[PDB]
RNA sequence: UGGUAUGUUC
RNA sequence: AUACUUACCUUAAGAUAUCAGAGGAGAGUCCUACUGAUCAAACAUGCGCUUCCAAUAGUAGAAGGACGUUAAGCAUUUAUCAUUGAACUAUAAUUGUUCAUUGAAGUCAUUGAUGCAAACUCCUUGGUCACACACACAUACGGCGCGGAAGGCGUG
RNA sequence: UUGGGGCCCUUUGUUUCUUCUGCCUGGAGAAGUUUGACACCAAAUUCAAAUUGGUGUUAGGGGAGCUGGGGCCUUUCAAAA
RNA sequence: ACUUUGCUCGUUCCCGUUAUGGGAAAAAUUUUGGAAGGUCUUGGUAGGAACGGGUGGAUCUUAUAAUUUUUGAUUUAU
């Protein structure tokens, strides 16, 4: 269905991750709330152009197709959606 | 008509009707009479070759394949010939066939 | 229809593919995704004759030491420009359709 | 780098394998993955990215390459601008040590259902 | 749908005289009852009537400036007054409850024997009688301790604090319901 | 259909307004924040020692190392290990948890602290202060607390407050010193302080 | 035929 | 932990490898602890197979780096426009030269950026293993030790 | 059981399976081990203490018995030259 | 191909006889498959088999060749 990376994206709400779009604008802020189409929405933004500059945004929301890549933070490293062995305990009928 | 609404595991005979009876009669003329099209691609490939197969994605299986692209520094034609290949729908610009 | 499955009957198949970055690939096909997502091994890889992206894309790929020798490759289907069979195998067998042939019957 | 690539592998079998994977610019990442998906997204860990300059792009032209490295550490990677994957670096440990690392996330899986129905009961 | 460009499709099917009986006259003037009631635990079901946005989008050009018609604003007028009684009745059901709980058998028999017990100094002691039967009061009643609300019906309580409580007015039920009291009364006072 | 890896629960069709809810309730948070914690002390905890390579020595390494001296080796009981130990745990998570705070504490009379060290009416970083507030839903968690909020505004001025020693200011903390270390203070001072 | 979360009393 | 109220929701389907033949069920479909063949997975197992596994008869060195130093190393390149005033080269929205009033944004960085090149130091990895400090080879090298890591092929 | 010689003790919590005692004039002793036990984190109950939710560990080597598979030799049956 | 009559060569044994025939085994020996024993080496030693699911996770097909990856505006050219 949703699969393991969008669970992973929307498993770091209210994070300071970075993004990166397919310009080369670099984004850096704390992530609001994600969604499983991967627009993503963030604050305390600071932002790079590519031309070099370096700005600030309040409030952004940057939609899921034109990201390169965002940057998690690293105790994420050890998650539960990376255990392949996890059994499930009776779900419902 | 609605896609998802229409029926379940018959939409390949709506399929082949559509290959039969819609924009798909030069592809479908091309693999029964065996006659040289000329594929223009977006990267100046065109290539003349006979169709041995169709596919909803339009890959094509194209068989003794001259293809032709120009050079613009000066002006040159290269050009290649290829026994067997297999063309992905996405690089197509345009199908031509000849009578 | 999809020819996806053609080139699921084609493994251990010492083919080329030509991406849409302008590569020509030179591999022996492992397996391949019903999304064409294809993995190729003992393969050379060549940019011919230009687009510096493409030279980038053939260096930054270790094991340069312009063919470069790789021993695995998987390709992304939306990458792939085309790719040419060896003309020594037989595409009037391989091409049988035995799904397309099911789907007759079962009409 | 006579690392020796698995000849019959797919991305279930490569994983926790130090990826170089290429896109379509050539900034290529370098690290662990970790999950993948149907559009191959991608999770790197310690992960690093690397790109040549303009001014270095007409001596790779036809030696010494200095490419420009950033660090990413832990990071998600999309599944549409990418090119291709490669295997560069082997992990740590082997694939004995991993079978006895599941056999025990295994048993200590069935060790904590057995105590989700003791404290079931 | 899996695919947007399904539900982007079935956006336009539905969205591409008028007196005809197919159209929803509640929803041709505005906020019809089974549609805000959808998918909540109030639920109605489903409306016989369809529901299209052309057909409201050409009812709010005339009511703009060309004119407006008076019947769907009475069967409007008419569906709203039926719901208000059936919300009302429930509501009455609920009051009814709530001093069936208040009026229990056991609990007016402890009451009884407390108020039995209750008769300057003889004063004092009735008063300090009746202020531990008040006490023994104020213990049965926050066994529940559930007031009723005056507008939804629903239950609330006095000893919760403002903000649960806002949290309880922002749902589906209480907007619709607010929504519902707001044009009848306006109804109401055009027709009076 | 979804399901939580942290607590252990499922739920019905995955709704995003259901799913949302999920993540802000106080269970999840408890079991999130505790996974979270327990993870980090696993992988901080985890001593990953090399293997050991120990190779045939030279002659003359031996013959220099078996004769200039036999060192001592001290070692302790399985309590006085384990407490000390324990004492060294409380002090790393002791000053992993601290930070000096002198600056706030310094500048408290300055014309500018309620509008930088304040921490709600600042600029940049006010507006999250201001956004989630934790709404105290729980009637008992806003009736608990019955001290002084103490809020500064900042509108306050250099005209409140204008001489700073009458307004009863407090004594600054004193440099703290190591405690293992405390016995080699100066006992004598060098003036004489009262009180 | 149900699930998730929250607030009171024992 | 029990009891109750409230807020949201109440589900895209079909199937689990392929081919040929025989039998059964009222041209088409289903089943066979039915038979032969291919393929996949798991467990064992062997191929004088393929690659790698760091001195100790010393104070070293292989692979990957430093987001380390010398190093502000050496050689180059840029660091805003317009109106007007006192002269002005002048096809421009006076561009060029010296000085200034005013007008819109106005990356920090010039100890900056690119290229070139050497030395030093420090991090992660290993069989830092068992015998010996030894005279072999045109069919170029007795690969005929105990293993480990990666892979190929073959068998049950 | 004692004594001598060589190496290792980074095992850095001085063996890291756990608990307790205990150690460099030594390298040890006692108990337990998967519907259990051990260690730790977080909290409101106003010291300590107790309760609840989770995390991680329960190991390595050798030997008797049983079983699966690989290779060699021997005995017997069926088939083809 | 069956069938008979005698000659010649011949694996082994017997007999008329060591020329040569008659009779028997129609054999000693090589390979394959199956049954048993001995020796060398390796793995495992507490879970396994059958059935049931308004069971969970993976794989395929169609929605889905149209703005969210995967059926293209990244070889910088008029």
Redesign the pocket.
Same mark, same amino acid.
């Given at each position: 269905m949703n699969?393991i990376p969008?669970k992973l994206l929307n498993e770091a709400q209210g994070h300071i991750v970075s993004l990166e779009l397919?310009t080369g604008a670099t984004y850096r802020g704390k992530l609001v709330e994600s969604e499983d189409?991967?627009?993503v929405q963030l604050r305390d933004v600071i932002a790079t152009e590519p031309q070099?500059?370096?700005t600030h945004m309040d409030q952004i929301f940057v939609?899921?197709?034109q990201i390169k890549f965002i940057v998690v933070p690293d105790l994420l490293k050890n998650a539960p959606l990376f255990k392949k062995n996890s059994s499930?305990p009776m779900?419902?009928? | 008509r609605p896609?998802?609404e229409l029926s379940?595991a018959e939409?390949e005979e709506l399929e082949e009707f559509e290959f039969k009876h819609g924009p798909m009669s030069l592809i479908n003329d091309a693999m029964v009479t065996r006659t040289p099209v000329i594929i223009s691609l977006?990267?100046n490939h065109k290539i003349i070759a006979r169709v041995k197969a169709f596919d909803?994605?339009?890959?094509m299986v194209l068989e003794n394949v001259k293809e032709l692209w120009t050079e613009?520094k000066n002006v040159i034609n290269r050009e290649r010939f290829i026994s067997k290949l297999f063309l992905?729908?996405?690089?197509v610009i345009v199908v031509l066939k000849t009578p | 229809m999809?020819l996806?499955?053609f080139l699921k009957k084609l493994r251990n198949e010492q083919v080329t593919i030509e991406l849409?970055?302008?590569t020509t690939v030179w591999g022996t096909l492992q397996s391949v995704?019903?999304?064409?997502?294809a993995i190729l091994t003992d393969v050379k890889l060549t940019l011919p004759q230009?687009?510096?992206?493409?030279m980038a894309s053939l260096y930054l790929t270790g094991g340069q030491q312009n063919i470069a020798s790789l021993q695995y490759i998987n390709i992304?289907?939306?990458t792939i420009?085309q790719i040419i069979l060896p003309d020594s195998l037989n595409l009037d067998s391989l091409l049988v359709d035995?799904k397309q042939l099911?789907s007759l019957?079962?009409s | 780098s006579?690392?020796?690539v698995?000849?019959?592998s797919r991305l279930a079998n490569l994983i926790d394998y130090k990826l170089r994977v290429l896109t379509?610019?050539g900034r290529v990442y370098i690290g662990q993955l970790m999950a993948f998906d $149907?559009?191959?997204?991608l999770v790197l860990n310690e992960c690093?990215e690397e790109r040549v300059?303009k001014? !270095?792009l007409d %001596?790779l032209r036809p030696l010494?390459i200095?490419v420009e490295?950033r660090?990413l550490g832990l990071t998600i990677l999309?599944?549409?601008?990418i090119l291709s994957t490669v295997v560069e670096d $082997?992990p740590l440990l082997?694939?004995?040590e991993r079978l006895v690392r599941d056999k025990?996330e295994k048993? !200590?899986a069935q %060790?904590?259902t057995?105590?989700r129905?003791?404290?079931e009961k | 749908m899996?695919?947007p460009?399904?539900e982007?499709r079935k956006l336009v099917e539905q969205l591409m005289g008028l007196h005809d009986p197919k159209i929803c006259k509640s929803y041709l003037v505005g906020e019809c009852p089974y549609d805000l009631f959808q998918?909540?635990?109030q639920?109605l079901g489903k409306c016989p009537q369809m529901h299209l946005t052309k057909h409201k989008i050409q009812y709010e050009r005339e009511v703009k400036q060309g004119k407006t018609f008076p019947e769907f604003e009475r069967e409007y007028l008419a569906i709203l007054s039926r719901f208000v009684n059936e919300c009302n009745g429930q509501i009455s059901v609920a009051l009814q409850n709530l001093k069936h709980t208040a009026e229990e058998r056991m609990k007016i028999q402890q009451v009884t024997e407390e108020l039995d017990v209750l008769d300057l100094i003889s004063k004092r002691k009735e008063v300090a009688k009746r202020v531990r039967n008040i006490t023994e009061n104020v213990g049965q009643s926050?066994?529940?301790?559930?007031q009723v609300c005056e507008v939804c019906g629903?239950?609330?309580?006095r000893?919760?604090t403002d903000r649960?409580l806002a949290?309880?007015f922002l749902?589906?039920?209480?907007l619709g319901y607010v929504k519902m009291r707001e044009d009848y009364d306006r109804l109401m006072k055009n027709n009076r | 259909?979804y399901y939580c890896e942290y607590?252990?629960?499922?739920?019905?069709?995955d709704?995003l307004?259901?799913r949302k809810?999920?993540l802000?309730?106080?269970?999840?948070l408890?079991?999130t924040?505790?996974?979270y914690?327990?993870?980090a002390?696993?992988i901080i905890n985890k001593?990953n020692?090399?293997?050991?390579?120990?190779?045939?020595?030279?002659?003359?390494?031996?013959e220099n190392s078996?004769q200039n001296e036999?060192l001592?080796?001290?070692?302790?009981?399985?309590?006085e290990?384990?407490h000390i130990?324990?004492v060294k745990?409380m002090n790393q998570?002791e000053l992993a948890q601290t930070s000096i705070d002198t600056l706030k504490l310094l500048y408290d009379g300055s014309p500018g602290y309620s509008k930088v060290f304040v921490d709600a009416n600042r600029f940049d970083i006010g507006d999250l202060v201001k956004a989630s507030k934790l709404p105290q839903?729980?009637?008992?968690k806003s009736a608990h607390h019955s001290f002084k909020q103490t809020s500064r505004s900042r509108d306050e001025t250099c005209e409140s407050n204008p001489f700073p020693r009458l307004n009863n200011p407090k004594k600054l903390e004193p440099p703290k010193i190591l405690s293992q270390w405390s016995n080699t203070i100066p006992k004598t001072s060098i003036f004489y302080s009262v009180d």
């Open positions: 699969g969008v397919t189409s991967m627009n070099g500059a370096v939609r899921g197709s499930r779900p419902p009928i | 896609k998802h379940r939409l977006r990267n909803r994605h339009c890959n613009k992905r729908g996405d690089s | 999809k996806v499955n849409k970055n302008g995704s019903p999304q064409m997502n230009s687009n510096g992206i493409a992304r289907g939306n420009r035995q099911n019957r079962r | 006579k690392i020796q698995a000849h019959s379509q610019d $149907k559009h191959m997204n690093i300059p001014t !270095q %001596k010494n200095k490295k660090v999309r599944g549409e601008q $082997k082997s694939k004995k025990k048993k !200590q %060790k904590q057995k105590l129905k003791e404290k | 899996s695919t460009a399904a982007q998918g909540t635990k639920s926050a066994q529940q301790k559930l629903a239950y609330l309580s000893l919760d649960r949290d309880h749902g589906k039920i209480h | 259909r607590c252990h629960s499922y739920l019905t069709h709704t307004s259901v809810s999920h802000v309730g106080k269970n999840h408890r079991i924040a505790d996974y914690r327990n993870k002390r696993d001593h020692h090399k293997r050991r390579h120990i190779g045939k020595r030279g002659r003359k390494e031996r078996s036999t001592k080796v001290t070692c302790l009981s399985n309590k290990k384990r130990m324990h745990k998570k839903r729980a009637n008992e």
